[PDB]
RNA sequence: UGCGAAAGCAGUUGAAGACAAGUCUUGUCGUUCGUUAAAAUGGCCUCG
């Protein structure tokens, strides 16, 4: 009856290799410059630059070949190497695949395989019919080897011939032309520049000569290179430091030139084709074009994220392709690819996947290097220890929630992700972001935070919900004070009510309630009202103290008011609170700590058994239908018939969920249809012979009262979220940002010739 | 790239009536008894004072016509519906009809009675007939053509009749209120001279007006009551007034957020606005030097600046007014494509906002404490700097000379509740950073001494407020 | 934009005596008259005025003080004396009232804000008292 | 929802036809037009006696009666008020059948007799509808003929449904249009269901369907808001118009125990998805949407009660939750007497709130899954424990802990499987019976820590554990749902310092300020006085409890002399608290000429 | 770092290897094992 299928996309793919800098972007612009080809972790999207739409999508699942192969794309080359809309995809292991865009995908692509002995393919590049491949083999520093790649038509095989080798490569970059390679080694360090297809350029020199004497006197941030760029001509080489200082070196005589604007680590450098301009970017979220003739600079500030990579793309520098990072979300690395028009610096094309914020860091994500070790960044020392600590936490520790809050708009079926201090509105039918709106105050896009400012925490959108009608948006925010002050521990809790006409795309704040439920009292649960009461124009907010407040929208006052209140000032605290409302609206089920209460809405007090004591704290209380009520505790899940007041079925959850999730996240793992049934979702780590970073999740469809399991299905990766679309199907989110769905004649020759001409 | 966010720094019915800012005060030779507005443009209003009637230009707010023929005191200046004529009553009992804006010629002079004629009002539906109420206690209904005998002579009032009203959409009905406390309704279609019925007010009725076709609101004694003709009983009654309410006016379908307004004079110096859509509840009020005898507001179709007029027994007249390259102009109406890419410049920033935008933390703090600086706006810049994490940074390069402006405000801002928490943060930091300089600076010491006395005073207030809070909980 | 801010404690939609002037001002909503009454600072006059004031008018007097305190917090102190005596003298009358929170919501909210300053005012006072002691002995 | 006591309308006459209590209801007809929510009149046709109209309030009274000869049976009766050619009139239409030889259709007009008319009908009259707007009387005959008459009984139209032996016909109005549906038995338990619309022909047939498996002889039928309800063999079948499709079957267990032949059953509707079901002398108010028994009432003073008609509420539109129903009650005795009685019925709000816990339909931890991943017999135990000899502490503990593999004397998360409440309740009964006096087993300590400790045993625990301080201390800390009315009693009675503070902590944690304050008022003035004297002799949880008391005591009850001691004592406390707060914050917190000595 | 409420309640930091400075003593880590465990004078466009 039910079936699972992946629908939406995932994160854009990146060359996630530490050594290579400035070559992280793999997306390629067509030779006609009419469309941008971007690889995702699960597909390849072709966007038309002129119209700003995804004209084509090549999904790995559809092809048997790509499904078997997809590993990550290391590069895309326009045309086919073996031989007008072909692309050659090189994967890290060595699979070379010739695909076609602008047409119908062929089920038998010209698959090949380069033969490499314990080498991981890192990069490939060409100038005119000549191809070289760079490969990585194994002091914790990887070594590199450069081969020449040729295709012999007779054998139809790719032959690789060794050309060169370097050891202990720390940082590496390739010119825009692809004909020069600059790299830094520990042979403290030495920088060497090599021509790739010729022997014309071959130079090497220690970093100490380039470094200034004062730099030798100062801290290690001043001696730590974070970026490197090489000009096409090879006459100039830019080195960026963790201090924020850029040094251009004249290779002929090793003369130095200092450019100093960045206050924090410079993350990306790129030269112009003529070499007369230098693009620089870092933590300021500002892109700087340094005019090298007069040493001047032009700015593009208030970008969406910190600039990981910069490039000038075109025969005439028509475009700037930037990679942005959005370091606010520590739970994941959120890359956004931005193609700007050089003439007016307007976004020609911005591409990103969904941006969930999970509870904890996932897999092997590491924060970008900064001058200092902050919450959003790592220091130069902190990187290795943080990586070890991340692995050790994912192995040893027992709390493995990685669960994310997601909302669905009943009217539009748009998917709302509460990013930190903002909301991303994402259309999973089109698999494209529709909006990004800031819903809180704070230092959001006023400036780029650097150094100590990077320890500031912007207000966090902890809950976001829609009314059943869908015309109203309810948001709950926690604003944090700055540190090192008397009021450095008084969190502020804010509630906001927004309205939006269906035609427009921007929500408008209609009411703001500061410190609802008192001072320093969190709003642990929010529940919009049913259609019966106020025509869905109301909601309940519930505390960790057992307080309940009912807000409703009053037409005369024209805005929301606290219609009802019940403030039992309990002297105990518990974040395990759950709320359910009967579809008739007469009764409200309020579960606090380990006790469930049935409160009459009209009196807004206990019904006149409404007390139900449970084994453990209630994480979720939901009613599949008017009759049955499903209550999940920390040890079990129970189906209680309200009409009989008896448990029909009880399932043991302790083996799978004992201390994995914080209280309240079972709510976002357990979802419920209003017609057919509900779903339970259970994740388990996979281990063979100590726990491993891999996870496997399983979905269970349950009928009303949990008598039977309609469907039992398995997904091969951690499912952060699962919720019920307002259709029959359920949408679930997986930590690779993947949204799956579980659901039920001479004239003819003349015409042809005229068309050809 | 996104545009830089801008720094983020009563009732609608009240806000509208706040707009009658311009107040002009005039002196009359005697008490102004009646005020009436011309129904037509320019909607000039006529004030009856002493032995003359003066008409005031709406735009100029100055007298344009004076009718000084009256030998004794005049008691009315009501216009006809079309605004050409105005009728006035005299203590001698003579009612005189003049053409508006033509004081010389007298169209019609009628001797209603030998007793004073206090009320002379034109019938709203019918232009021909004029109503007169005298101390004779008979409200004769005259016709301009028949100047020698009234068309009808309503009677039945056992005391002075000083109020007469015509119910809209009911030309046959006539309402009269006497000092008996009775409001009498008459039918001119029938024989008349006997009321259809009487409504009891229990206090002398000083003015009666028909708010709507079915609702009539009468002000007598210390309250005004709204009566429904269909049910013949008072729906509602308001007694917020302290003295005896004297006059009341009603304006409907004017451009305010509130559809209709009921103005009522009080004789305590108060004239207040009542909203008929919300059960005749108070929404506005004005206070004057002395008792108010007459009130008027410009009609609905004012077509210009609106006027609110108050009449006082001392003769004062108070007016509040709500004031209402040959191809450069082509605009491309004949062209295929029209491209508009111009962007308006952002609204002017202040000095402190410019400093924050340019990362001038120390200078932004200086702009906070400048002479003539709004206290709320001073609190924003202090909150912005805290939010940016720049509180110590703003306070490094400072000495006693440039620290006193901050401490002076903190000395006053600690008293305010909103700024109390912010003052604690800033004062805590400056002490932690400038402990040593304070020892060597005598002036900085006394600033802290008076700061310690005030913060001690605030502690007593907050402790006190807790005790009343405990008291209040006990009562409930 | 034009959104109105609010707070969670807004439970709104859930010889020498001056009593006669006070009573008339309260009945007639005469702010100017009421202000002249409240200008007096002599505690003897306050208690006496509330003592002879009619119990019915006592409730609205609490409302007016709540509003005047809220607009101007610097007058929190002197008007708290007025509120304090209204409760003490008319405590018996106030008990026999169907509802108090909804009609005294402004008062109750106004009193909450002042108490919230108390924990932090002590913290500032302790740091002041420490530094005041340090140079005074030096 | 509730059922009122029946109040008598009239006493049925002692006629031979009415003597058969099983068929008594069929001989009494209730007019549809006069019996509704807003009408205060009931027009009733008693076979062989008369057709009578009664006013219900303020007292039952007879207003009009039309005598009928005793040999006649009333087959259909209806009355409606309206305007006829214009005078306000009341039209009465009734059909009488005499020994099956002839059928009489009669129409009577009354001024609010103006006229009386009589014709011979072709077959037995089953249903009569009066249309005052068109001045028409519509009669449905057993032979399938629907005949439309004027108020003078002149035949205007006649429609044949082509089927005979009509058994059920019901009128209903939807969107202003009049409709009627009929049921005609066939052979082999088959039935033709026809839906007819009343507008060349004023009768238009909309649907005709054959229904299989629908028996008449043992079936009770009623229709309400487009749903036809069939009671048969304890199961209520719900058929939905306009096609009469079976939607739901509701099994009613309380009828399945009825022996076939002796139990008299009546079935009528009262509101949306709510009906009245009577079994002999018992009356039930049932909700079919939730399958709940909203109310039940037994009439001990009558043998049987048969529903005749009920004024139905359209609860979706009407704010009124009160209606009435009329039935025939039969008294107990050698000379049974039948009487017409009316019952006032409160149907409720039609919400789930009314139905909760009232199902008329009468466990074990199951593994979540039937079948290399990170890991995060009650009946037997009771028998073993019960088989011990009295006062055997060691074995009772040994059997309980060993069999259940419980490792700790207190409840832990690993004991989830034991949480079956039935086992716990029995063991508590055993522990109480097995042990009395000063020696309880360690099992009681484990149960006292159990989150699912039965509510039934919570009362009086503190008294039972009063003897042993250790058990008393445990119950305060961990025993769930301990009553507050008790906890306050021990709070003001116990003198131990330690127990008072723990009781203070437990009371505030599990009970609201409002809830506790009400019970504090009940306590005696001397006991609270001692508690106040105790204080003057964590602490804020005690003081906050004191502050609650003073509010409970009120301003009148407090006494000045004691008030001075409390006032002096607290002022000392406030001074100390201010002192400590100051300490707490503290922990949180060149010359032109100088002479010096040079060091060589 | 773990649990917890926001309050808090418990606990945690070690062994190397390599290099720079002084002249045998100290620091650092683009390096490993284990443990739940500040500071290169350097600030954010134009489109009136």
XYZ file of C-alpha atoms in Angstrom, chain B residues 79-82 121-131 141-145 151 166-167 170-172 188:
27
model
C -29.762 78.337 8.636
C -32.123 76.629 6.234
C -31.101 73.334 4.656
C -29.972 75.029 1.435
C -35.233 76.296 13.577
C -35.997 75.657 9.919
C -37.627 72.357 9.036
C -35.001 70.139 7.441
C -37.215 68.275 4.963
C -39.464 71.241 4.081
C -37.950 74.649 3.355
C -41.212 76.605 3.487
C -42.053 76.019 7.161
C -40.166 77.475 10.142
C -40.465 76.364 13.778
C -44.993 76.090 13.266
C -44.838 78.994 10.814
C -44.732 79.171 7.034
C -42.726 81.850 5.252
C -45.616 82.549 2.877
C -49.760 76.784 10.235
C -36.937 67.388 13.507
C -36.479 63.643 13.094
C -39.996 61.763 9.343
C -41.125 65.209 8.149
C -44.444 64.821 9.968
C -47.956 67.661 12.081
